[PDB]
Write a protein that binds this DNA or RNA. Structure first.
Lengths: 17, 78, 208, 144, 70
RNA sequence: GAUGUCAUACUUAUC
């Protein structure tokens, strides 16, 4: 389930604070 | 030392196609493709023997990011 | 009396033409001199077989006929196929009634078109040299490539569009050639982006 | 229905099982019964669309260690742990120039991804099962 | 079958001194294995290149003399 | 692949 959730998250919404 | 093993290739790839793919990095002296004579299909592996061991190592080191028919082809020393 | 193949290879100036069956002949030196001549033709490979060069292609599929362009550009093949399709459906009574009162004008295409196809539209066939003999497997051995060039089938299989811009037209193995250097087996190989100009050398490789 | 008898290009019959030829039609039907023919016969997407995106304000606290960052996240009420991954700056929504660094971004399902740029080549490991932890009792995420 | 082994020249002992004195059960099989990877790997240990002059070479001394004569 | 009996088919503008 963690591998399915990590492969479906958006990796383009980057936010640097 | 002069022979490199290529794996991860599809059954639709041919031996002149593999020779033309391997000739971009160096002239290959021989190319062996083990295939079953009963069905007439390849096993997905081949052996490319060049003229020297250093040229074979340079060809195996430069073929780590080759993709044929959507499948990544791996090159190893043999 | 009969020497081995090693003495026949060492005595003759051309040991590449020496075979294993030539050592037991009546004249090894004369056979080695005749086989290594300038304009001599080799013997066929069917002299030592047991099928008489005609029992190999038994179950292999073969096309009936390969018509040229000058014969197919006259419309005679389609008319012959239509006549064969119309004659195959006729019975014995339709074939017997057409012999007493036949119908003239079967195709009746033209009269000068065949002369124009045989005199003006004549094409030279693909001949070969006199030294290149014919064998049983010569019709199937068509595999008999250049460094720096890629065919359309290899580019379609690898997924590399060949274009004038050298950004994506070289394969992705060029990054290893930039990180490691030129191949040692081809010192005269010139690739665009490393040792060649990118808009000039648009062929993705040059042997200079 | 014999799958071995075929027609050649000369108007004959060919048996590919025993590799035999027959001129007339009466010789192909009589070649099936025999010793050689009998010998040849005997020898032969949903989780990505349903993810809510409200993008809250994250709270990350970095600290230079020597031998580590702490991200304070709210209660997610789920078993899915927030995952960290290192990516390149070549892919972006607007693609700015001079982007040649790497960024380690941690993402969760009810929260937004927090990314930190790493100018160095390799100083740590961005693996999830190696040097990361997520205390669900205090909801504290750490990665070193 | 004995007929296919007697007509094709099979079941005939042949010795190849180049590849560690190996055995071959046919003249045509030995001629096909001479231009193969095993005979090339056996000849590469002695330093002789894989060419057409050493196709019918069996002994190591004869192959060394043919390599030194060229 | 050879052998010996039978059958089919083909060729040399054969009669």
């Amino acid at each position: 389930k963690e591998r399915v959730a990590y492969a479906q998250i958006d990796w383009h919404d980057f936010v640097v604070v | 030392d002069a022979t490199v093993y290529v794996g991860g290739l599809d059954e639709k790839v041919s031996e002149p196609l593999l020779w033309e793919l391997f000739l971009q990095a160096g002239p290959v002296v021989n190319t062996h493709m083990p295939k079953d004579r009963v069905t007439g299909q390849h096993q997905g592996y081949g052996f490319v023997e060049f003229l020297s061991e250093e040229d074979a190592d340079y060809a195996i080191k430069i073929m780590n990011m080759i993709k044929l028919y959507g499948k990544p082809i791996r090159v190893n020393k043999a | 009396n009969r020497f081995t193949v090693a003495e026949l290879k060492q005595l003759v100036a051309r040991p590449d033409v020496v075979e294993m069956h030539d050592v037991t002949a009546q004249d090894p030196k004369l056979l080695v001199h005749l086989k290594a001549t300038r304009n001599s033709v080799p013997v066929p490979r069917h002299w030592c077989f047991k099928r008489k060069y005609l029992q190999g292609k038994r179950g292999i599929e073969k096309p009936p006929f390969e018509l040229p362009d000058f014969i197919k550009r006259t419309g005679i093949q389609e008319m012959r196929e239509a006549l064969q399709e119309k004659e195959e459906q006729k019975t014995m009574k339709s074939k017997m009634r057409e012999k007493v009162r036949p119908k003239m004008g079967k195709i009746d295409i033209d009269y000068q078109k065949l002369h124009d196809a045989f005199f003006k539209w004549q094409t030279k066939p693909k001949l070969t040299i006199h030294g290149d003999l014919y064998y049983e497997g010569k019709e199937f051995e068509t595999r008999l490539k250049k460094p720096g060039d890629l065919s359309d089938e290899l580019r379609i299989s690898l997924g590399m569009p060949v274009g004038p811009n050298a950004h994506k037209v070289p394969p992705p193995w060029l990054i290893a050639m930039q990180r490691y250097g030129p191949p040692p087996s081809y010192p005269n190989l010139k690739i665009p982006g490393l040792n060649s100009p990118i808009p000039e050398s648009c062929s993705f490789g040059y042997h200079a | 229905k014999d799958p071995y008898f075929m027609k050649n290009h000369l108007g004959s019959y060919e048996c590919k099982l025993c590799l035999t030829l027959h001129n007339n039609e009466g010789s192909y039907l009589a070649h099936t019964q025999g010793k050689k023919h009998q010998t040849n016969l005997a020898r032969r997407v949903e989780v990505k669309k349903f993810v809510k995106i409200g993008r809250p304000g994250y709270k990350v606290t970095k600290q230079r260690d020597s031998e580590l960052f702490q991200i304070d996240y709210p209660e997610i009420a789920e078993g899915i742990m927030p995952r960290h991954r290192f990516m390149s700056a070549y892919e972006q929504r607007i693609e700015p120039p001079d982007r040649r660094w790497q960024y380690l971004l941690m993402a969760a399902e009810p929260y937004e991804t927090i990314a930190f740029k790493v100018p160095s080549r390799e100083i740590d490991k961005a693996e999830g099962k190696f040097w990361t932890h997520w205390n669900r009792e205090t909801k504290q995420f750490f990665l070193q | 079958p004995y007929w296919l082994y007697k007509l094709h020249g099979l079941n005939i002992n042949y010795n190849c001194e180049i590849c560690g004195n190996y055995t071959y059960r046919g003249p045509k099989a030995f001629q096909r294995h001479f231009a193969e990877w095993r005979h090339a790997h056996g000849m590469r240990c002695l330093g002789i290149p894989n060419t057409a002059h050493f196709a019918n070479v069996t002994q190591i001394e004869d192959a060394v003399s043919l390599w030194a004569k060229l």
